[PDB]
């Protein structure tokens, strides 16, 4: 499925012109401030739900579980503990 340089196994390419400049000709950090602020905000905003939803749910679950567990092993939780066992 992959070849090597010269016969990589691309479908034939034609009609794309690629341009680039030397690393010595370019400012490596051009527009870094804009990227670090606006680009990172954009990328983070678009992915935030996929992280927040599972994290918040499992943290809530753990919090409820750990709090119940703590309470069952108090004096107040004697009866509920006896039933749970």
């Amino acid at each position: 499925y992959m070849g090597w340089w010269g016969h990589m196994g691309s479908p034939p390419q034609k009609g794309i012109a690629g341009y680039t400049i030397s690393p010595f000709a370019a400012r490596p950090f051009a527009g870094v401030v804009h990227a670090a602020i606006f680009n990172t905000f954009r990328r983070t905003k678009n992915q935030a739900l996929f992280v927040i939803l599972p994290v918040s749910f499992f943290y809530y679950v753990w919090t409820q579980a750990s709090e119940k567990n703590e309470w069952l092993y108090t004096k107040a939780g004697r009866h509920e503990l006896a039933k749970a066992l």
């Binding site: 499925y1 691309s10 479908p11 034939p12 390419q13 034609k14 009609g15 794309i16 990227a35 680009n39 990328r43 678009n46």
Partner: protein
Amino acid sequence: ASITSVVKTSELILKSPLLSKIVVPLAKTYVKFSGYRQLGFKMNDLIIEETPNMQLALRRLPPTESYDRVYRLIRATQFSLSHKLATGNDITKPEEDDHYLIPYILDVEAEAFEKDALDNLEVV
């Protein structure tokens, strides 16, 4: 899963009025959130091609379609490495998101599935 299976199942859904009424709007939103159009891909550009069947289908694409596919992949790869999104004409509009490859792969698979069936035939 095979493109044939996906296409057949989709046709079952689009047939049933009830089913299409609830599925078509969901699928449109799914595709909007999928966000492949924001990198200038057409849906069919995403299909796994490292299978013998798909290699055959790609070889059967008309030259123009093939050259443009290569461009969309290169362009998208450059957006990916730059962490930028397409803007303006680079974004795939819904009207340009044509199933250019589906007919070719359906034909490749149809013959491969016929071949499997016929390899198992029993003279009655």
